[PDB]
PDB file of C-alpha atoms in Angstrom:
ATOM      1  CA  UNK B 464       6.598 -10.996   5.623  1.00 27.74           C
ATOM      2  CA  UNK B 465       3.180 -10.142   7.125  1.00 29.47           C
ATOM      3  CA  UNK B 466       1.029 -13.593   7.261  1.00 28.14           C
ATOM      4  CA  UNK B 467      -1.312 -11.732   9.498  1.00 27.83           C
ATOM      5  CA  UNK B 468      -3.730  -8.506   9.605  1.00 28.26           C
ATOM      6  CA  UNK B 469      -1.646  -7.378  12.706  1.00 27.45           C
ATOM      7  CA  UNK B 470       1.692  -7.748  10.761  1.00 23.80           C
ATOM      8  CA  UNK B 471       0.673  -6.122   7.950  1.00 21.39           C
ATOM      9  CA  UNK B 472      -0.495  -2.780   9.538  1.00 19.33           C
ATOM     10  CA  UNK B 473       3.032  -2.978  11.475  1.00 22.81           C
ATOM     11  CA  UNK B 474       4.365  -3.347   8.062  1.00 21.82           C
ATOM     12  CA  UNK B 475       2.508  -0.064   6.594  1.00 20.04           C
ATOM     13  CA  UNK B 476       3.137   1.719  10.008  1.00 20.72           C
ATOM     14  CA  UNK B 477      -0.997   1.732  10.897  1.00 17.83           C
ATOM     15  CA  UNK B 478      -0.465  -0.584  13.821  1.00 17.13           C
ATOM     16  CA  UNK B 479      -2.153   2.171  15.890  1.00 15.31           C
ATOM     17  CA  UNK B 480      -5.132   0.934  14.184  1.00 16.32           C
ATOM     18  CA  UNK B 481      -4.851  -2.559  14.349  1.00 16.10           C
ATOM     19  CA  UNK B 482      -7.504  -2.851  16.615  1.00 16.07           C
ATOM     20  CA  UNK B 483      -9.686  -0.564  14.816  1.00 16.57           C
ATOM     21  CA  UNK B 484      -9.419  -2.678  11.923  1.00 15.99           C
ATOM     22  CA  UNK B 485      -9.931  -5.777  13.966  1.00 17.18           C
ATOM     23  CA  UNK B 486     -12.933  -4.253  16.305  1.00 21.30           C
ATOM     24  CA  UNK B 487     -14.489  -3.633  12.540  1.00 24.71           C
ATOM     25  CA  UNK B 488     -14.524  -7.258  11.605  1.00 22.85           C
ATOM     26  CA  UNK B 489     -10.886  -7.061   9.830  1.00 17.45           C
ATOM     27  CA  UNK B 490      -8.910  -9.619  11.512  1.00 16.93           C
ATOM     28  CA  UNK B 491      -7.051 -11.368   8.377  1.00 16.95           C
ATOM     29  CA  UNK B 492      -5.650 -10.130   5.233  1.00 19.29           C
ATOM     30  CA  UNK B 493      -8.522 -11.489   3.301  1.00 19.63           C
ATOM     31  CA  UNK B 494     -10.796  -8.973   5.490  1.00 18.01           C
ATOM     32  CA  UNK B 495      -8.405  -6.315   5.021  1.00 19.44           C
ATOM     33  CA  UNK B 496      -8.019  -6.981   1.302  1.00 22.17           C
ATOM     34  CA  UNK B 497     -11.499  -5.760   1.263  1.00 21.11           C
ATOM     35  CA  UNK B 498     -10.650  -2.284   3.251  1.00 20.26           C
ATOM     36  CA  UNK B 499     -11.724   0.736   1.540  1.00 21.52           C
ATOM     37  CA  UNK B 500     -11.839   4.321   2.416  1.00 20.21           C
ATOM     38  CA  UNK B 501     -15.537   4.261   2.462  1.00 23.77           C
ATOM     39  CA  UNK B 502     -14.789   1.576   5.217  1.00 25.45           C
ATOM     40  CA  UNK B 503     -12.425   4.143   6.993  1.00 23.00           C
ATOM     41  CA  UNK B 504     -15.202   6.671   7.207  1.00 21.47           C
ATOM     42  CA  UNK B 505     -17.068   3.977   9.556  1.00 22.50           C
ATOM     43  CA  UNK B 506     -13.974   3.037  11.426  1.00 23.34           C
ATOM     44  CA  UNK B 507     -13.581   6.796  11.692  1.00 24.58           C
ATOM     45  CA  UNK B 508      -9.903   6.646  10.117  1.00 26.50           C
ATOM     46  CA  UNK B 509     -10.287  10.314   8.938  1.00 24.12           C
ATOM     47  CA  UNK B 510      -6.090  10.314   9.449  1.00 24.94           C
ATOM     48  CA  UNK B 511      -5.236  11.202   5.512  1.00 25.22           C
ATOM     49  CA  UNK B 512      -2.297   9.873   4.895  1.00 28.99           C
ATOM     50  CA  UNK B 513      -2.863   6.803   7.299  1.00 30.44           C
ATOM     51  CA  UNK B 514      -5.893   6.241   5.156  1.00 33.70           C
ATOM     52  CA  UNK B 515      -3.762   6.305   2.070  1.00 32.61           C
ATOM     53  CA  UNK B 516      -1.908   3.642   3.229  1.00 30.76           C
ATOM     54  CA  UNK B 517      -4.667   1.313   4.819  1.00 31.04           C
ATOM     55  CA  UNK B 518      -6.205   1.735   0.965  1.00 31.49           C
ATOM     56  CA  UNK B 519      -2.989   1.116  -0.584  1.00 31.96           C
ATOM     57  CA  UNK B 520      -2.135  -1.912   1.799  1.00 32.21           C
ATOM     58  CA  UNK B 521      -5.985  -3.257   0.874  1.00 31.72           C
ATOM     59  CA  UNK B 522      -5.364  -2.642  -3.094  1.00 30.89           C
ATOM     60  CA  UNK B 523      -2.142  -4.474  -3.125  1.00 30.83           C
ATOM     61  CA  UNK B 524      -3.384  -7.316  -0.516  1.00 29.11           C
ATOM     62  CA  UNK B 525      -6.389  -7.928  -3.101  1.00 27.50           C
ATOM     63  CA  UNK B 526      -3.976  -8.803  -5.808  1.00 24.83           C
ATOM     64  CA  UNK B 527      -0.432  -9.362  -4.074  1.00 23.63           C
ATOM     65  CA  UNK B 528      -2.079 -11.885  -1.364  1.00 22.31           C
ATOM     66  CA  UNK B 529       1.190 -14.446  -2.145  1.00 20.92           C
ATOM     67  CA  UNK B 530      -0.852 -16.404  -4.544  1.00 22.72           C
ATOM     68  CA  UNK B 531       2.251 -16.751  -6.445  1.00 20.92           C
ATOM     69  CA  UNK B 532       3.731 -15.201  -9.535  1.00 20.23           C
TER      70      UNK B 532
ATOM     71  CA  UNK E  34      -3.104  -8.215 -10.929  1.00 17.04           C
ATOM     72  CA  UNK E  35      -0.410  -6.386 -11.166  1.00 15.75           C
ATOM     73  CA  UNK E  36       2.728  -7.846 -13.311  1.00 17.78           C
ATOM     74  CA  UNK E  37       4.942  -4.253 -13.859  1.00 16.22           C
ATOM     75  CA  UNK E  38       5.484  -0.764 -12.359  1.00 13.26           C
ATOM     76  CA  UNK E  39       3.069   0.807 -14.318  1.00 13.04           C
ATOM     77  CA  UNK E  40       0.068  -1.638 -13.567  1.00 11.66           C
ATOM     78  CA  UNK E  41       0.925  -1.158  -9.806  1.00 13.84           C
ATOM     79  CA  UNK E  42       0.481   2.327 -10.177  1.00 13.32           C
ATOM     80  CA  UNK E  43      -2.611   2.067 -11.800  1.00 11.66           C
ATOM     81  CA  UNK E  44      -3.760  -0.320  -8.970  1.00 14.12           C
ATOM     82  CA  UNK E  45      -3.161   2.286  -6.157  1.00 13.57           C
ATOM     83  CA  UNK E  46      -4.245   4.981  -8.393  1.00 14.99           C
ATOM     84  CA  UNK E  47      -1.180   6.754  -8.625  1.00 14.68           C
ATOM     85  CA  UNK E  48      -0.341   6.085 -12.419  1.00 14.69           C
ATOM     86  CA  UNK E  49       0.052  10.139 -12.580  1.00 15.55           C
ATOM     87  CA  UNK E  50       3.108   9.433 -10.630  1.00 17.19           C
ATOM     88  CA  UNK E  51       4.238   6.357 -13.164  1.00 17.87           C
ATOM     89  CA  UNK E  52       6.564   8.377 -15.444  1.00 20.62           C
ATOM     90  CA  UNK E  53       7.839   9.938 -12.156  1.00 21.66           C
ATOM     91  CA  UNK E  54       8.592   6.267 -10.933  1.00 22.33           C
ATOM     92  CA  UNK E  55      10.006   5.120 -14.399  1.00 23.64           C
ATOM     93  CA  UNK E  56      12.379   8.265 -15.001  1.00 25.76           C
ATOM     94  CA  UNK E  57      13.496   8.107 -11.678  1.00 24.56           C
ATOM     95  CA  UNK E  58      14.590   4.236 -12.416  1.00 24.88           C
ATOM     96  CA  UNK E  59      11.442   2.602 -10.892  1.00 25.84           C
ATOM     97  CA  UNK E  60      10.418   0.680 -13.859  1.00 22.86           C
ATOM     98  CA  UNK E  61       9.838  -2.541 -11.760  1.00 20.53           C
ATOM     99  CA  UNK E  62       8.081  -3.676  -9.141  1.00 21.13           C
ATOM    100  CA  UNK E  63      11.468  -4.594  -7.831  1.00 19.12           C
ATOM    101  CA  UNK E  64      12.280  -1.058  -7.949  1.00 15.91           C
ATOM    102  CA  UNK E  65       9.670   0.082  -6.675  1.00 17.49           C
ATOM    103  CA  UNK E  66       9.957  -2.301  -3.646  1.00 16.58           C
ATOM    104  CA  UNK E  67      12.669  -0.019  -2.710  1.00 19.20           C
ATOM    105  CA  UNK E  68      10.584   3.170  -3.133  1.00 20.18           C
ATOM    106  CA  UNK E  69      10.759   5.263   0.064  1.00 20.23           C
ATOM    107  CA  UNK E  70       9.329   8.567   1.197  1.00 22.56           C
ATOM    108  CA  UNK E  71      13.097  10.270   1.336  1.00 24.91           C
ATOM    109  CA  UNK E  72      13.389   8.736  -2.183  1.00 23.60           C
ATOM    110  CA  UNK E  73       9.405  10.516  -3.115  1.00 19.41           C
ATOM    111  CA  UNK E  74      11.523  13.749  -1.551  1.00 18.64           C
ATOM    112  CA  UNK E  75      13.866  13.260  -4.467  1.00 20.08           C
ATOM    113  CA  UNK E  76      11.250  12.371  -7.327  1.00 19.39           C
ATOM    114  CA  UNK E  77       9.391  15.613  -5.839  1.00 17.38           C
ATOM    115  CA  UNK E  78       6.443  13.692  -4.989  1.00 18.43           C
ATOM    116  CA  UNK E  79       5.325  15.886  -2.043  1.00 20.64           C
ATOM    117  CA  UNK E  80       1.936  14.786  -2.603  1.00 21.23           C
ATOM    118  CA  UNK E  81       1.191  13.907   0.954  1.00 23.16           C
ATOM    119  CA  UNK E  82      -1.692  10.874   0.791  1.00 20.32           C
ATOM    120  CA  UNK E  83       0.167   9.858  -2.848  1.00 19.57           C
ATOM    121  CA  UNK E  84       3.015   9.538  -0.807  1.00 18.50           C
ATOM    122  CA  UNK E  85       1.271   7.548   1.920  1.00 17.95           C
ATOM    123  CA  UNK E  86       0.015   4.908  -0.919  1.00 20.51           C
ATOM    124  CA  UNK E  87       3.323   5.065  -2.850  1.00 17.45           C
ATOM    125  CA  UNK E  88       5.529   4.240   0.423  1.00 19.97           C
ATOM    126  CA  UNK E  89       2.611   1.510   1.086  1.00 16.66           C
ATOM    127  CA  UNK E  90       2.796  -0.097  -2.133  1.00 15.22           C
ATOM    128  CA  UNK E  91       6.631  -0.364  -1.698  1.00 15.52           C
ATOM    129  CA  UNK E  92       6.536  -1.638   1.900  1.00 19.77           C
ATOM    130  CA  UNK E  93       3.907  -4.562   0.453  1.00 19.46           C
ATOM    131  CA  UNK E  94       5.743  -5.293  -2.518  1.00 17.08           C
ATOM    132  CA  UNK E  95       8.465  -5.661  -0.861  1.00 18.02           C
ATOM    133  CA  UNK E  96       7.251  -8.698   1.357  1.00 16.56           C
ATOM    134  CA  UNK E  97       4.123  -9.363  -0.966  1.00 15.41           C
ATOM    135  CA  UNK E  98       5.877 -10.088  -4.089  1.00 13.52           C
ATOM    136  CA  UNK E  99       3.802 -13.033  -5.467  1.00  9.72           C
ATOM    137  CA  UNK E 100       6.573 -15.091  -3.503  1.00 11.40           C
ATOM    138  CA  UNK E 101       4.013 -17.637  -2.688  1.00 12.23           C
ATOM    139  CA  UNK E 102       2.345 -17.978   0.549  1.00 14.01           C
TER     140      UNK E 102
END
């Protein structure tokens, strides 16, 4: 159960890009839930499947931010 | 905010495979959180980025199942 941005990247297997997110202002799950593919374009994360993971993570974090059932 | 499997697939943009999950026994988020790439191999979801999304969704659903903060 990730509580921080870093942990979330570790969760999905993109901890290789934790710094990428972090440096681009994505320091929290609240930031990462705003992360989009168009943003990965900016972050220069052209890694296709890695993108797909990052986006999906952001998708779910936007709704599943542990805000109870 | 998806409460069901179908909605989750819609969330990540893999509603094309909702039936795939559903038919393979993934009818709930509780099922999908067990969804792995090796499973997509079985579901014949060789769609690389789609896989990546599906897996990430399963990753996050496993921890972020709206079980509060």
